[model samples]
Target: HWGYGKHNGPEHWHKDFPIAKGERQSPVDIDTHTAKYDPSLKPLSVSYDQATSLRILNNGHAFNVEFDDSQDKAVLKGGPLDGTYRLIQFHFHWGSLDGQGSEHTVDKKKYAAELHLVHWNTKYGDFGKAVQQPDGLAVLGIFLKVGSAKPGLQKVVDVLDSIKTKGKSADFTNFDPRGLLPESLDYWTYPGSLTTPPLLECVTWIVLKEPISVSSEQVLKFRKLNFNGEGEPEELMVDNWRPAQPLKNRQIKASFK
Candidate 1:
């Protein structure tokens, strides 16, 4: 399987999936000075019900909180999107050590971690079907800083022990993802792909400008997760992020001054 190892890492992904070499790859370095500012961008509209959260699981790659997106119970609209996108799942990417990790960098500076909230366009029927469409996915990226403790995140951290091993999952509910975001709606917009394989070029990336704070202690707990399944060599799950890809001819637009 594709993993963040020396043998099966991002560099070798192109050997199996040719789309890994595509023009609009994700985790690109955002040069804020070069990004164009547009005043016409609308404020992002996010409505997530605490009841929509279903379960949290360790998929070996990264831990994710799945949602009951069978209905329009949780949805995101406005911003750079043409239509409403339903919430599917949310996950994080961090490094093995502090001071580095985030997939997307700002001015080439890496953060401690990054949070990805995955959503799929309602027009595409469902997530499985949308993965192949052009305007199918929309992911909101939030950078995590090491400073004050984030109370909202503690709720998620409390459940990590239950899913410490790969393929492990717990029934997690009544959690609203909105509480995890920063106050600012300011973001950088661009076209990108999934950081992991199939590496499709179908995502419209909306990366928030302001990063949310998490305690340094909490950041270290993420490394405790086992990347390998039970009985495996107990590989730690860290540095699961892909490196910054080429920007090619794409232009990044900012939603605020």
Candidate 2:
């Protein structure tokens, strides 16, 4: 019911998810000039150890690749976080076209898409518990642009056909989540919430300055996915990103000047 359509889109989400209007909501329009450089902050450390992806789920809104979190090995450190956070799932947000798709923007310009690698603080033991804390989740937002094909991402695009419809899922494993990161770890960190419905305000966003590449053909492949469940009228999954929210009471800091 809370799909990205005109009647039930982002503007309408606030009715059900009151947090949609909450302070510190994510995907803020990051004005680079306003981002303060914090030398005290350390470079982000990510070690996926050949990330053990369990399966991919087509939840209508987006496709997420779930991960094994029984251990604290694939943890993330640094960048506004003190304890190790285990990656649980990773997903993307985008639009119907290449020119504009990303949930977060830089100086009001949108990228082709955005990748979100979701991690929960290991100390919290479980995602449910971690999500309750203000510093519970750490999300790395890597922007995507249409350019040369990325081998790491192509593997995912190739599998899109397996889940063209909503409520579908397929197994995916042994994927190196690190291979999906941009060469530069330079990032902007801040307090923010999830960009989706229920808009949980439990995320510490670490959005990279550099963007990863995806091919034009790849974007088409994602558009092939349907938001409607099987037997329902086929509706493409596009423009699935919430508009940038206000950066209230937040001071965004960057790793580099």
Candidate 3:
């Protein structure tokens, strides 16, 4: 069982999942200077239907807000994508403290947190199949800074109490995730894998340059989440992020100059 804990954390992941040492691993630290502006990159097109939101679940690793993947109500197109990708789910990664947490970094600067809007290509049929393909996934990354409160996120925060343990879940519907996006769609893109184990090198990472402000108080609420199951010794679900991986000669392209 892979986890961010002392025993089963990332260091031990490669023993079980060999791809952990792969060339295109994710959450790489982005050195802005190395990025080359590509005029060919188009502005992203994100169409999300609020009603498609089904529920939020604590998958023992991270809490993910799942949607109706059967339909294309929530789709992400353009912006480094050759085909339209379906929004499968969206979730976040956070730090134990207000100073750190983000999986992907900028010039070695880690954000207070990060939001990943996970999408999959329809050509691969479903998540099970898509995850196996080389260009099957697209994860839009949004950095979270500590500042003003994001009322847009309160809907998710307010429900934390109900899902305090792993495997717990609650209804999370009619949520339009666009409000969480920063004003600028400008981004740095690269080829990468899933930050977690079974680290498939299938993701086209589109990480935005701007960050969204999340209240310091609101971030603390995330710690109340448990990493263990209902009967086990309670373990706080903080620092559930994977450290940045090597860029390994991967080119970092920017949508802006």
Candidate 4:
């Protein structure tokens, strides 16, 4: 199985998941100086209903808060998108240490952690079908810095102890998605793939320029999650982020100055 380990990590993922070498791979470095400022980009419009939140799960890779996308309850519009994208789930990636876990870096600087809110285009019907097309998905990437405690994220942190092992899950609902976002919606847009397997090249990435704050103690709770199952030797989950991929010829468009 592909994991963030010495012998089975990102470097060797291509062996089994060949799509890892695809042109539109994600987690690319954001060189602010060269990013194009696109006035044509629409202001991002995110509408998420707190009631749509369903449950939270320890997917072995990361902890994800799943949402109900059966209807247009929580959707994302505008900002480099052609149609509405329904919010499906949101998860995170972090490291064992401070200042070193973000997937996409700005000017080559890594942050403490990163958050991803995954959505699927309505044009393709269901998420399963949409993920197979080029315009299938739209993921919002938010960087996380360590500083003052984030009251907004306390709700999520409170559930960590319940899902400390792989395959564990708990009912988590009535949480507003808006609370997890930064004040500024400014972002960088690009075409890229899922950072994980199948590694489908169907995501339109919208990485927020502003970062949210989390306390150092909260950051440590992420590492408590185990990559292994209950009966297996415990493996601490950390550095669960893919290294930045080559940008190739794709241009990154910024929503603001």
Candidate 5:
């Protein structure tokens, strides 16, 4: 039940979610001397054409970008707090080895992919009824290091052959995903859930301690995407990722103001 196929990855999703072996997960490996996160609590200012009501969807497992509840107040600003939330999709999590991206790790290392924006609240009105409500949602975590240049993620790997299967998606027009955010939004907030499969614990994650680059052949063409789509002959999808969970007494916070 872990995913991808032909012997999944992430160590086979930690052998069927074995509590992800020990999760605090995320694209780790950004050592700046044991990064002691502290971003003033929560500080991130993002707004590209008021977020262009960015669409770009695909639901099988990944490839998303669907925010637009009337532009959710042009993507709120200020308020080491919360209120405005409208983004809908934004995904990616890989590994085939640009050096093994991430699913979750801290002291172990691994980073080559991990980008998820997925917003929802908008005061519980949009996002198709705010994903059924529960505290709405919010997930902003970025980390994908490969270096040498490719930083701006070729507009999401040039749509990687158009969502290469699994629920498929197209029409990625005029993209602006905060231009693939990550000039350092200095984060670390928490209250997690949803690493996949009904795993919706109504996230609030934040991650981003600084990481954004792409190379190693665009991480081997996103590990040769193709979880079963487009053609079907070149199915590799490397390791989609997932394996890091268990913060039970969770309460992680950060912000560098």
Candidate 6:
């Protein structure tokens, strides 16, 4: 709820984002090649259009990309997925540096950061109404790791000058948000809740185990995308990720064995 440092950051979000209480929160460590093999789940193939419209809006804290429902070209048959959840909005979560750039960590290893693609199930009707329901949304998390090279995240970084600070955004016309996805569909899925406030208890999380490459310098740029309007740019949102949460009694199902 509060800014970087002190007791406000994510350390204090649970006090406000109550879903942190009972709901299955994310960044849980599901390290492959470590746990026993179970293969009951698989990443559901996404069938969406290549020509969908992506609307980018800077929502103060983050840049959100909203897609149109009527533009859904992907048709998933059946599973936990109920309605034709259209790609509604997507955003990124960054950390101060490459080593600490994610909102959720796996085994305390913070890669770079993670990206979230938010979709609203039409079965619940409209984004506004759907977000209020427990099973009305889905968020796919993709991990980015900074390396010696460029990670091609310039698409996002290049636009920072527009929404340089909080609550400021510029339109990114004719951009295909799907292109932002790291070419790996293989993911780990589970029934979970929103990572943010008003943590609704109805969200199926798809956390891709694949880590994408990002340049160390690229990660530094995120620190420039400060949250505060002034005062040394404050702490970069890049390192704003929460540590891995305990699974407790939660049973997270994977897509593959």
Q: Pick by lDDT: which candidate is best?
A: 4
TM-score of 2: 0.98
Evaluate model 1: give its lDDT: 0.92
- Once fitted onto the true fold, the runs of candidate 5 whose alpha carbons sit more than 4 angstroms away are 1-28, 37-39, 43-62, 73-88, 96-99, 103-105, 111-115, 118-139, 142-167, 170-186, 189-229, 239-257
What TM-score does candidate 4 get on C-alpha atoms?
Answer: 0.98
Q: 1-257 in candidate 3: lDDT tens per residue?
A: 99999899988999999999999998899999979999999998888754288899998888999889897778999999999899888889999997789999998899999999999999999898999999999999999999999989999999988888999999988887877888899999999999988999999999999999999888999888999989999999999899998889799999998
RMSD to the hidden true structure, all candidates: 0.9, 0.9, 1.0, 0.9, 17.0, 3.0
Runs with alpha carbons beyond 4 Å of true place in candidate 6: 1-4, 31-43, 51-54, 70-80, 148-152, 230-235
Q: What is the TM-score of each candidate against the true structure?
A: 0.98, 0.98, 0.98, 0.98, 0.33, 0.84
Local error of candidate 2 at 137, Å? 0.3
Query: Lowest lDDT 10-mer window, candidate 2?
Result: 45-54
Cα misplacement distance, residue 251 of candidate 2 (Å): 0.7
Candidate order, lDDT descending: 4, 1, 3, 2, 6, 5
lDDT of 2 at 206: 93
RMSD of 2: 0.9
Q: How much lDDT does each candidate structure score?
A: 0.92, 0.90, 0.91, 0.92, 0.62, 0.65
Lowest lDDT block of 10, candidate 3: 44-53
Q: State in Å the error of residue 230, model 5.
A: 2.7
- Model 2 lDDT per residue over 52-119, tens place: 88899899999999999998768899878988999999999988989889999998999999999999
Off by over 4 Å in 1: none
The alpha-carbon lDDT assigned to residue 60 of candidate 2 equals 94
Q: Write the per-residue lDDT of candidate 4 for residues 1-257, one digit (tens) a residue.
A: 88889898999999998989989999999999999999999999988753389899998999999999988988888999998999999999998898799999999999999999999999999999998899999999999999988887988988999998889999998878788899999999999999988789999999999999999989888888899888899999899999999999799999997
Lowest-scoring 10 consecutive residues by lDDT in candidate 1? 42-51
Report the lDDT tens digits of candidate 6 across residue range 1-257: 45445677667776766666674766577655543334545446566544454556555466676555664543332334655666766777776555666765665677777888777777766778877787777777888876645434677677776766666666665656555567766666666776666657667777776777777766666667766654444545555556677666666555556
- Per-prediction count of colliding residue pairs? 0, 0, 0, 0, 14, 15
